[PDB]
């Protein structure tokens, strides 16, 4: 290890307050490992190379590579209309049915809206039923939008074109040919040996969090792997002498950036079949994924054969910039200050605001007691009856299809205290107002 | 003109609601012009090629080129300590004096905090006095932060090293050798023939806005130019065959991206001496600038000898990316949907909220009048006395050195109505509460 790099790792881990962090750094054959923390705080399970982490959205790299393999063998083509493989699919743009090529989903130019993540994330029907009659945000091929639901359609395409369940396709095409020992696409809700227990921030400290793994979302997330397996993954991507010819050509095509999309002035990030492609001081080929209880980012710089990977036990934006920070250290020897984590900021904001609301409630209760001393129902509870519905419908008004389920799952666990905090404050305040009117 | 491109221009103009828009598009020698709108709504002054616009932050390209010319002649070096040219300068990091090279200011690695724009934007002494004992946000050379005030220090460096006022240095070095007919760096507040009157959004429509041009801020903004002048400017950055050798080599060095700064995962935008450098489908070399009452963004793609130059009569984020939309059209023939302009969004939000506050005030006044009809001072005005100070100090609490002057200058003119709206609402509400207590 480089002591400075290990200090970087520990600093980022402590600032993100994640229970465990696993980082591997490859430099043109030379490798370094950074395996730290506890895979489970509830039993102080020491974190180790053998523990399994959820890859999050990096799963899309595996799905993209599988689709590129299928394309190389000629079983599937980029220009194929999706109806050829998902006849049940119907998608609307301005109320008009829209034909989408497999390439449109492959490069996130399908126009599916981000709120679709909430509906496919539902454990619950194939992808067609969960996307039946969905209304697109934009025309196919006219824009780039990282709607995470896109690669589930690619999962259905893989399943139908190949005639097997996604897990078997993964095992046959990627895990076994690459010699990977533990990487697996779960068959939905499943138990795996020595999996690190997922954690999510709540009230300033990690909270053990687990939710069912939607069967239909695995082709875009929830692929499980170990750090040694991801080292083999990085090695397979960086250098390819031993690989089969079909696999090598599929990887070569996998990095072809989708140039035919409008690009904003300050972003110009190209997206290949799974990988962000950035030409600035690169090619800096990378992705990044935060699951509700896991986060992971991988970065490849093949021109210098540098490969980074950060698998973490908890969702936090800091371990999505962690691979960029490590690459910056390797390139320069300097790294930026830790970015303000959105999850941490939101959790601290809710701590402050719910504590303030409870203090407000205590103050109003004290004033009510004082007025009762100075003096010595359904009508009041109606106000909570309205506030409950108002808050229940509010997220759906702000965004279409945004269920409170999504907010509870993705946001910090303290988010729930805001609805109940507001409802309790309204309860006590309205009741005391009615009492004062009676008094 | 390409009719589709002209439609793009008109669409962006109408959505941004700018009084006037001037765009020139050069394609490997072939050129197109788009001169539209009125340079002044107060007199319907038809916008024309001869009208002068403020270049905003694309001025930094001129100052950067001047510094690079001085560097080529050997009068100045990148590694020179700033104290050599500004002995009056003192800057602190964690309370410790910090030595800054001229390169630090040239590539925005100085650590000055963006709020120094408010102090230098103040008409108000040299740059040293206005930056005397300033506290840096980060160590020199350790980070990239687009503190717009950086190039004013470079203006002082130019003046001291060259021994002339900045305007004369510009005229001698850039305007005259390049044959530019009207581009001039103003000597502070100055009157120029056929300048387009500045405009800023207010209550949903443009408002004629003019503020003094701080003399000390000219080396980083407020340089004036015409569209033919910017066409010559583009033809000088490209097609360098006819230029002097020293000027050619200065331009060659001017695009040298500062690689020694940490780069975020999703940005990786390199900054040369005035120009953002992007390798994605490029080199895409471009700056972009919004003044309080002007906006303009230039974009070059030398490998294909393309370059847009959009100058505008009004500040709006859309025309700060209309030289990226045009590149997208040229490259692909497709362009993205108009981004939500921050100025437009803020102005509409303040329209809604101040109208709601006035409606609230009317309702409370109506209830007070009813209670007066239901009935047949300094004590109440004290509440406004507190609210006034609370709102006055509030921006300074949120950010260091953020004067209400800055908010009024940069924000839409409706922003002032929020202080007064809140103060009037508190006035009427507290007065009616006191009256009810008396009643």
Numbering used by the authors:
A (entry chain B), B (entry chain A): 39 to 162, 165 to 416, 433 to 495
Give the text the authors published on this PDB structure.
Although the transmembrane domain is required for colibactin activation, its role in catalysis is unclear.
Crystal-packing interactions suggest that ClbP forms a dimer, and we confirmed this same dimeric species in solution using single-particle cryogenic electron microscopy (cryo-EM). To directly probe the oligomeric state of detergent-solubilized ClbP, we determined its structure by single-particle cryo-EM. The resulting dimeric ClbP structure is nearly identical to the crystallographic dimer (RMSD of 0.830 Å over 904 residues), except for a ~5° bend of each TMD toward the dimer axis. We also identified a branched density in the active site of both subunits that likely corresponds to co-purified phospholipids. Overall, our cryo-EM structure confirms that ClbP forms a stable dimer in solution through interactions matching those observed in the crystal lattice. In the dimer, the two periplasmic domains form a canopy over the cell membrane under which the active sites face each other. We discovered that ClbP forms a dimer that may promote the simultaneous activation of the two colibactin warheads, further supporting the proposed pseudodimeric structure of precolibactin.
